[PDB]
Protein backbone atom coordinates (compact mmCIF):
# COMPACT_ATOMS: atom_id res chain seq x y z
CA UNK A 260 0.00 0.00 0.00
CA UNK A 261 3.07 2.25 -0.05
CA UNK A 262 2.58 3.66 -3.54
CA UNK A 263 4.14 6.59 -5.38
CA UNK A 264 1.92 9.21 -3.73
CA UNK A 265 2.55 7.94 -0.21
CA UNK A 266 6.26 7.26 -0.57
CA UNK A 267 6.92 10.72 -2.01
CA UNK A 268 5.03 12.36 0.86
CA UNK A 269 7.00 10.36 3.44
CA UNK A 270 10.29 11.28 1.72
CA UNK A 271 9.54 15.01 1.79
CA UNK A 272 8.25 14.93 5.35
CA UNK A 273 11.11 12.78 6.68
CA UNK A 274 13.64 15.29 5.48
CA UNK A 275 11.49 18.21 6.64
CA UNK A 276 13.03 17.32 10.00
CA UNK A 277 15.74 14.78 9.20
CA UNK A 278 18.55 17.10 10.22
CA UNK A 279 22.13 17.00 11.37
CA UNK A 280 23.98 17.28 14.67
CA UNK A 281 22.04 18.06 17.84
CA UNK A 282 18.68 18.44 16.05
CA UNK A 283 19.08 14.86 14.91
CA UNK A 284 20.20 13.63 18.35
CA UNK A 285 17.23 15.07 20.20
CA UNK A 286 14.87 13.41 17.72
CA UNK A 287 16.13 9.86 18.15
CA UNK A 288 16.20 10.45 21.89
CA UNK A 289 12.55 11.49 22.07
CA UNK A 290 11.67 8.50 19.87
CA UNK A 291 13.41 5.95 22.13
CA UNK A 292 12.20 7.68 25.30
CA UNK A 293 8.58 7.38 24.12
CA UNK A 294 9.13 3.76 23.08
CA UNK A 295 10.82 2.75 26.35
CA UNK A 296 8.06 4.63 28.23
CA UNK A 297 5.19 2.82 26.46
CA UNK A 298 6.99 -0.53 26.54
CA UNK A 299 9.54 -0.76 29.37
CA UNK A 300 9.92 -4.49 28.72
CA UNK A 301 11.62 -3.88 25.38
CA UNK A 302 14.72 -2.44 27.07
CA UNK A 303 16.05 -5.92 27.79
CA UNK A 304 16.92 -6.20 24.09
CA UNK A 305 19.22 -3.17 24.17
CA UNK A 306 21.78 -4.06 26.86
CA UNK A 307 24.55 -4.17 24.27
CA UNK A 308 24.04 -0.44 23.71
CA UNK A 309 23.29 0.58 27.29
CA UNK A 310 19.51 0.90 26.93
CA UNK A 311 19.16 1.57 30.67
CA UNK A 312 20.93 4.87 30.11
CA UNK A 313 19.73 6.61 26.96
CA UNK A 314 22.03 9.59 27.54
CA UNK A 315 25.20 7.50 27.41
CA UNK A 316 27.35 8.16 24.32
CA UNK A 317 26.88 4.44 23.57
CA UNK A 318 23.09 4.50 23.30
CA UNK A 319 23.27 7.88 21.56
CA UNK A 320 25.42 6.14 18.93
CA UNK A 321 22.81 3.42 18.56
CA UNK A 322 20.01 5.95 18.21
CA UNK A 323 21.92 7.75 15.46
CA UNK A 324 22.57 4.48 13.64
CA UNK A 325 18.83 3.76 13.69
CA UNK A 326 17.93 7.14 12.18
CA UNK A 327 20.53 6.54 9.46
CA UNK A 328 19.00 3.17 8.62
CA UNK A 329 15.61 4.81 8.54
CA UNK A 330 17.03 7.54 6.29
CA UNK A 331 18.54 4.93 3.94
CA UNK A 332 15.38 2.84 3.49
CA UNK A 333 12.94 5.75 3.24
CA UNK A 334 15.15 7.15 0.47
CA UNK A 335 14.95 3.87 -1.43
CA UNK A 336 11.14 3.53 -1.39
CA UNK A 337 10.80 4.28 -5.14
CA UNK A 338 13.74 2.02 -6.09
CA UNK A 339 12.53 -1.52 -5.63
CA UNK A 340 15.80 -3.47 -6.06
CA UNK A 341 17.97 -1.01 -4.13
CA UNK A 342 15.38 -1.04 -1.35
CA UNK A 343 15.34 -4.85 -1.27
CA UNK A 344 19.12 -4.98 -0.95
CA UNK A 345 19.18 -2.63 2.04
CA UNK A 346 16.28 -4.03 4.09
CA UNK A 347 17.69 -7.53 3.60
CA UNK A 348 20.82 -6.14 5.25
CA UNK A 349 18.67 -4.70 8.04
CA UNK A 350 16.96 -8.10 8.30
CA UNK A 351 20.34 -9.71 8.93
CA UNK A 352 20.99 -7.24 11.74
CA UNK A 353 17.74 -8.01 13.58
CA UNK A 354 17.22 -11.72 12.89
CA UNK A 355 18.89 -13.57 15.83
CA UNK A 356 17.84 -11.07 18.50
CA UNK A 357 14.50 -12.66 19.34
CA UNK A 358 12.52 -9.53 18.59
CA UNK A 359 8.81 -10.12 19.06
CA UNK A 360 7.33 -8.76 15.79
CA UNK A 361 4.57 -6.78 17.56
CA UNK A 362 7.34 -4.48 18.77
CA UNK A 363 7.51 -2.96 15.26
CA UNK A 364 3.95 -1.71 15.62
CA UNK A 365 4.93 -0.03 18.89
CA UNK A 366 8.02 1.51 17.32
CA UNK A 367 5.71 2.97 14.69
CA UNK A 368 3.43 4.18 17.48
CA UNK A 369 6.32 6.04 19.09
CA UNK A 370 7.47 7.53 15.80
CA UNK A 371 3.99 8.89 15.01
CA UNK A 372 3.79 10.37 18.50
CA UNK A 373 6.97 12.44 18.17
CA UNK A 374 6.76 13.47 14.49
CA UNK A 375 4.12 16.16 15.09
CA UNK A 376 6.78 18.22 16.89
CA UNK A 377 8.75 18.63 13.67
CA UNK A 378 5.93 18.45 11.12
CA UNK A 379 3.14 20.21 13.02
CA UNK A 380 -0.38 19.59 11.75
CA UNK A 381 0.84 18.36 8.36
CA UNK A 382 1.91 14.85 9.41
CA UNK A 383 0.34 12.33 7.03
CA UNK A 384 -0.21 9.38 9.34
CA UNK A 385 -1.76 7.14 6.68
CA UNK A 386 1.13 7.52 4.24
CA UNK A 387 3.57 7.06 7.14
CA UNK A 388 1.82 3.93 8.40
CA UNK A 389 1.70 2.25 4.99
CA UNK A 390 5.34 2.94 4.11
CA UNK A 391 6.72 2.04 7.55
CA UNK A 392 4.98 -1.35 7.23
CA UNK A 393 6.83 -1.93 3.97
CA UNK A 394 10.10 -1.28 5.78
CA UNK A 395 9.19 -3.38 8.82
CA UNK A 396 8.08 -6.30 6.60
CA UNK A 397 11.50 -6.17 4.98
CA UNK A 398 13.32 -6.14 8.31
CA UNK A 399 11.22 -9.02 9.63
Ligand code: HEM
Nearest residue numbers: 301304305307308324325328329352356358362363366394
Ligand atom coordinates in the same frame (compact mmCIF):
# COMPACT_ATOMS: atom_id res chain seq x y z
C1 HEM B 1 12.16 0.85 10.87
C2 HEM B 1 12.49 0.41 12.09
C3 HEM B 1 13.94 0.10 12.50
C4 HEM B 1 15.09 0.48 11.91
C5 HEM B 1 15.31 1.37 10.67
C6 HEM B 1 16.19 -0.07 12.67
C7 HEM B 1 17.53 0.11 12.39
C8 HEM B 1 18.58 -0.42 13.10
C9 HEM B 1 20.00 -0.18 12.85
C10 HEM B 1 20.60 0.71 11.74
C11 HEM B 1 20.70 -0.86 13.75
C12 HEM B 1 22.25 -0.90 13.83
C13 HEM B 1 22.75 -2.29 13.45
C14 HEM B 1 24.26 -2.37 13.49
O1 HEM B 1 24.94 -1.43 12.99
O2 HEM B 1 24.79 -3.38 14.01
C15 HEM B 1 19.77 -1.57 14.61
C16 HEM B 1 20.09 -2.40 15.66
C17 HEM B 1 19.22 -2.97 16.56
N1 HEM B 1 17.82 -2.86 16.55
FE1 HEM B 1 16.74 -1.88 15.05
N2 HEM B 1 15.66 -0.80 13.71
C18 HEM B 1 14.28 -0.73 13.64
C19 HEM B 1 13.38 -1.33 14.51
C20 HEM B 1 13.71 -2.04 15.65
C21 HEM B 1 12.78 -2.52 16.66
C22 HEM B 1 11.26 -2.30 16.58
C23 HEM B 1 13.48 -3.18 17.61
C24 HEM B 1 13.02 -3.89 18.91
C25 HEM B 1 11.79 -3.79 19.40
C26 HEM B 1 14.87 -3.12 17.22
C27 HEM B 1 15.92 -3.67 17.92
C28 HEM B 1 17.26 -3.57 17.61
C29 HEM B 1 18.31 -4.19 18.38
C30 HEM B 1 18.16 -5.07 19.64
C31 HEM B 1 19.62 -3.80 17.68
C32 HEM B 1 21.05 -4.20 18.08
C33 HEM B 1 21.50 -3.39 19.30
C34 HEM B 1 22.90 -3.81 19.66
O3 HEM B 1 23.84 -3.39 18.95
O4 HEM B 1 23.06 -4.57 20.65
N3 HEM B 1 14.98 -2.42 16.04
N4 HEM B 1 18.48 -1.27 14.19
